[PDB]
Symmetry: D2
């Protein structure tokens, strides 16, 4: 499904939203 990443989603993935954990924001990548 969607995988959390920083700083950005990678080739093939579309950024759908945001994840929050360990005190920070991440890209939610689908």
């Amino acid at each position: 499904a969607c995988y959390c990443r920083i700083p950005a989603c990678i080739a093939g993935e579309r950024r759908a939203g945001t994840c929050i954990y360990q005190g920070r924001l991440w890209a939610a990548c689908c």
Copy 2:
């Protein structure tokens, strides 16, 4: 890394936080 799921993380996974996309919350599972 961390994978977003509903309604909960599954066996082997630790819930680290939350994902936000398509208008809803998901479990962030690591």
Copy 3:
């Protein structure tokens, strides 16, 4: 001072992001 609201921010307010609580997303309004 950002204030959490649904379904949207009101006149005079700028939507800056999102809040999460009580199981749902809200507009963060600044």
Copy 4:
């Protein structure tokens, strides 16, 4: 009725959740 803050909610307020904007997390204080 919920207001976003860092680093914590203050006296009289209870932390209900989290806000996301300008690249960081905030406490959602109700």
